Structures are given as structure tokens and as C-alpha cells.
Design brief:
about 130 residues, alpha/beta, five-stranded parallel β-sheet, binds lead (II) ion, hydrolase, response regulator, CheA
């Protein structure tokens, strides 16, 4: 009953913020971290997480590209969490068409404390994602 989450973000500060949000829940556990797309794919195969929070702009391989490889090699539920994934945005549409279940819009840039604003929403998305098969 413990949802296993893989947190992907090039910012260590955001990875920590997301860790605090997720690990504080009685029904969730962050099983691993990834700081770029390459690690995201590797950790997705290795850990076989139930849900993956996916940042987009990252060095070496972006989140969109990691998403495609994961959905082919080790398909699972992915929620895009980026400053770019806004409602109606082209990149949001692109993520969704490639297998992503949903998205969260980071308020105030790629890195910020204000992120806690969308914390309840993110937790809701993670729980809801378990109700669909990608
Ligand atoms: Pb980023």
C-alpha cells in the first residue's frame, strides 16, 4: 500500500523539497532520486517505481526524452513537474501524448520554496495516477 516514487530533478534543492512532501505521507516512499534524464531512465529500470515525478530541463538528457525511453523500456506512471508544463502549453501536450499521466506547474521558476503551494495537488496526482494504467 506504500506508493514507491522516483523523484527526478536537476536541482538538489527541489529534490529535497519534493522528498519532504512525499516522504511525510503515510502512503508514499521516495525510493530513489535522479538528477538528470540518463539517471532517470536507469533508475526507472532498476527501481521499477510506481510513480515518477519528472523535471524537463536537465543536463545530458531532458525529461521529455527520458519519458519516451522509460515508456518503452520500463513503462510506469509519470507526472511532469516543471516550470514549463503550464495548462494548455505545447510542451505539456507533448508530455501527455508521449505517455505522461499528468503534470504540475512549478510556481515561480524551476527552483523555489513557493513550490509547497502545489504540494497538495502533487500528492493528489500521485494517488490518482495509481488509478490508471499507462
Ligand atoms: Pb530543471
Amino acid at each position: 500500500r506504500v506508493i514507491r516514487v522516483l523523484v527526478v530533478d536537476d536541482s538538489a534543492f527541489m529534490r529535497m523539497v519534493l522528498k519532504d512532501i512525499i516522504d511525510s505521507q503515510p502512503d508514499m516512499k521516495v525510493v530513489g532520486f535522479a538528477k538528470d534524464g540518463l539517471e532517470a531512465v536507469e533508475k526507472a529500470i532498476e527501481l521499477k517505481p510506481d510513480v515518477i515525478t519528472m523535471d524537463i530541463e536537465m543536463p545530458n538528457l531532458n525529461g521529455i526524452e527520458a519519458l519516451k525511453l522509460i515508456m518503452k523500456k520500463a513503462p510506469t506512471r509519470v507526472i511532469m513537474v516543471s516550470s514549463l508544463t503550464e495548462e494548455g502549453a505545447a510542451i505539456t501536450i507533448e508530455a501527455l501524448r508521449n505517455g505522461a499521466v499528468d503534470f504540475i506547474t512549478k510556481p515561480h521558476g524551476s527552483i523555489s520554496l513557493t513550490f509547497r503551494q502545489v504540494a497538495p495537488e502533487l500528492l493528489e496526482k500521485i494517488r490518482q495516477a495509481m488509478n490508471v494504467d499507462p
